[PDB]
A paper describes a structure:
Jasmonates are phytohormones that are pivotal in mediating plant responses to various biotic and abiotic stresses and regulating plant growth. The first crystal structure of [name] from tomato (SlOPR3) showed that the enzyme crystallized as a self-inhibitory dimer in which the L6 loop, a critical loop involved in substrate recognition and coenzyme binding, from each protomer intrudes into the active site cavity of the other protomer. Based on these observations, it was postulated that the formation of the self-inhibitory homodimer represents a mechanism for regulating [name] activity and, thereby, jasmonic acid biosynthesis.
The self-inhibitory dimer of variant [name] differs from that of the wild type, as only loop L6 of one protomer intrudes into the active site of the other protomer, while the other loop only covers the active site entrance of the other protomer. As a result, the active site of only one protomer is entirely blocked while that of the other protomer is still accessible to at least small molecules, as evidenced by a bound MPD molecule above FMN. The folded hairpin-like structure of L6 that only covers the active site of the other protomer is stabilized by an intramolecular salt bridge network between E291, which usually lies above the flavin cofactor of the adjacent protomer, R294, and D243. In detail, D243 electrostatically holds back R294, which in turn prevents E291 from moving toward the active site of the adjacent protomer. Unfortunately, it is unclear from the structure how the amino acid substitution induces this semi-self-inhibitory dimer because D283 is not directly involved in stabilizing the folded L6 conformation. A comparison of the protomers in the [name] dimer shows that in protomer B, D283 forms a salt bridge with R343, like in the R283E dimer, whereas in protomer A, D283 is not involved in any interaction and thus free to move. We speculate that this freedom of movement translates to the whole loop L6, bringing D243, E291, and R294 together. D283 is located only 3.5 Å away from D243 and thus might push D243 toward R294 via electrostatic repulsion, indirectly supporting the salt bridge network that stabilizes the folded L6 conformation. However, in all cases, the strongest contribution to the dimer interface comes from the interactions of E291 with the catalytic residues H185 and H188, except for the semi-inhibitory [name] dimer in which E291 of one protomer interacts with R136 from the other protomer. Nevertheless, our crystallographic data show that substituting R283 for an oppositely charged residue generally affects L6 conformation and thus the dimerization process.
Author numbering:
A (entry chain B): 10 to 296, 302 to 384
B (entry chain A): 10 to 384
Amino acid sequence: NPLFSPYKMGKFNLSHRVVLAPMTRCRALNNIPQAALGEYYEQRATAGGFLITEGTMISPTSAGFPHVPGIFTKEQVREWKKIVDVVHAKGAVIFCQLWHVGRASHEVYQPAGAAPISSTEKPISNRWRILMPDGTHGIYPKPRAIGTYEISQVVEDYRRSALNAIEAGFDGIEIHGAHGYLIDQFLKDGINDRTDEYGGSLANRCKFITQVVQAVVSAIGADRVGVRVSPAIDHLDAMDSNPLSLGLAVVERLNKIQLHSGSKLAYLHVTQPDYVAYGQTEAGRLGARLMRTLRNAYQGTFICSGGYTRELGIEAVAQGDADLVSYGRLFISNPDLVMRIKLNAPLNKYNRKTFYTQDPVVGYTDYPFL
Amino acid sequence: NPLFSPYKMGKFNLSHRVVLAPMTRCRALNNIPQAALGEYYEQRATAGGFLITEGTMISPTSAGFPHVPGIFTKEQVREWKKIVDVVHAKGAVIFCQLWHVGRASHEVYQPAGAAPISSTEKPISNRWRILMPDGTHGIYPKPRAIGTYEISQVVEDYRRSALNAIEAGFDGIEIHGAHGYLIDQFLKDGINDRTDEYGGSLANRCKFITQVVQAVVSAIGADRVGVRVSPAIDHLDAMDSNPLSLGLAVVERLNKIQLHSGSKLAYLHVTQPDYVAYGQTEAGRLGSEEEEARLMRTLRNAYQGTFICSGGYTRELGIEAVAQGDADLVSYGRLFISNPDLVMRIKLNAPLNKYNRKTFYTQDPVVGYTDYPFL
Ligand SMILES: Cc1cc2nc3c(=O)[nH]c(=O)nc-3n(C[C@H](O)[C@H](O)[C@H](O)COP(=O)(O)O)c2cc1C
Ligand SMILES: Cc1cc2nc3c(=O)[nH]c(=O)nc-3n(C[C@H](O)[C@H](O)[C@H](O)COP(=O)(O)O)c2cc1C
């Protein structure tokens, strides 16, 4: 099983290639990591395994979900430390994902009810609804287009949050630049309609993710920085006319950051849509090797994500399409997913109803082990 | 095994509940049924089993795949007859699926290179491809929105083809009203942007499928007509803002057609969604497998008659669906491609041949068509 052959991720020696994908679960009451998060990550931690945390706030304006953790206050860093300590006691490596939702927020989630910030003034369309603090779903409001001068202020929030993460004991950080959130709102030409130096051409649209990665790379070192992109995922109206060229342009910038710093990033993390069920239709399979194309052009560690199974993950590693395989949904309901992939044992099903609830046990830590 | 308890599908008494799902295979060279189809359907026919044919053209404008069979010419009728006879010789029941692709076509498939017809002028998005006659995967073009008289012309094509089907010996026909093809392009508010009496509200959007079903029911009788739909589907941009209400509106129409005709349709056939949610919140999308099951059972409980489910089913999922009352029959597609004796394999709980997607749509009369081995 090539999923359990050791792999050196920069300076971290991993014993296997099964990775916990970042997953918002909304158990961090009041934006403060709670003891429940420790038991949740401790359950899934393994000796020499790689874990990525749920998206974590970098500032008071970056949230678009209820009760998601932040890492922009020393109070939050102190709570994260207790969680990271428990995870390191099991021998796992843990990165914290730095998450800013941009226009994918609501006044109820913003201080003083301010409008969310984004690259554009265009709101997410009515085809998408935001989970509200009362369990209902509401409308995405019109965001405020941040001025050219303000982009460096947001970059500074990433930089400070990476430093707070190191202060909490995290091994590294992952930049959340996928799924139509703030960074993807600058990448995709279906959203970025800016006239300034951050909009228009492909090179300009990659300016934002570049300065963000450069800022955290300089602060804590490249080998502690991972980057997650989703060029071909249309979530929250975040479509690009040419996902291939966008992906390659990002890879080009990432290779350049590594060449300038003289160090390789922790990894590149690319996620794709799950077309598992398109085989039962007449035309679902007619006609995109983007994953392999980006893997071929990138210099360093590649984590593939999106609809991967035990058999698909094995094939991906044995084929060389990726070095590590991250699992989301399966990890929600299978705390010992690593061992289950080892033994090829049956997997538990997940319950969508408790993805985003606040119970510290129900649907969170009560999925059974083998 | 509840799958092998008999079932009375109207006037047809079936011996088991394993159904051959309709599957385009592209072996009907020049749109004429070929001897290969006879051997293909013969291999899968069982005594008292139900078969549904590949989607079959109702008119020269109805195709969006290469070498798909027609049933709108008398030559096609004569060739189908030979195939139905071999199936009937094995004691099987066989329906012919009537299929119009509408905007899911290309100029290379249309008479005189004309534009495909549809409810709208909007083309299928760049996320989808069409199979071209040379095996390449191409881009769907802009269709032509058709008017009221032309719509009635299409209904007449369905009606004439229904009559040809029974003249060829078929036990009945299935209306293909799923997967974003012509009927679904009228049903789904994600496709139908019309402002006339065929677009807008749910009532207007269900007008076309209602007229098609009524025409064929009046022509050959209700108990020889089945209807297939897919209210929650990504295929070919066939999204709807409220798949549940759309599905119930259709069921209401079918129930009323049955009451007015004093007879019941052969069945309602509903396909599972071709997608699985990932925690997202998109209008018109089912958020979980549990909501998916509730959708299907709600349509089943609403329809006055036989219910066939399809889409990713296995032996275990098919037993459960029948045991739990979720469906009366279960149709299998890909597993039937690679397992000509799938019925016996389900019965014996035997291993199943893998299928080769390569050869689903090639034109070879044997390779990947009739060369899958028996037990
Ligand atoms: C409930 C839930 C929460 C998620 N939260 C995040 C997140 O905070 N950050 C992120 O980058 N991806 C997030 N994801 C996406 C996962 O990483 C996703 O499941 C993965 O990209 C696809 O892998 P899978 O097929 O194994 O589920 C989330 C997914 C789910 C279902
Ligand atoms: C190759 C192929 C061709 C198909 N052709 C048709 C068709 O012509 N008409 C139709 O209504 N469905 C068609 N379908 C959908 C199937 O009838 C059925 O809904 C699907 O195969 C069920 O899923 P399963 O293969 O997992 O059993 C086709 C499916 C496949 C895979």
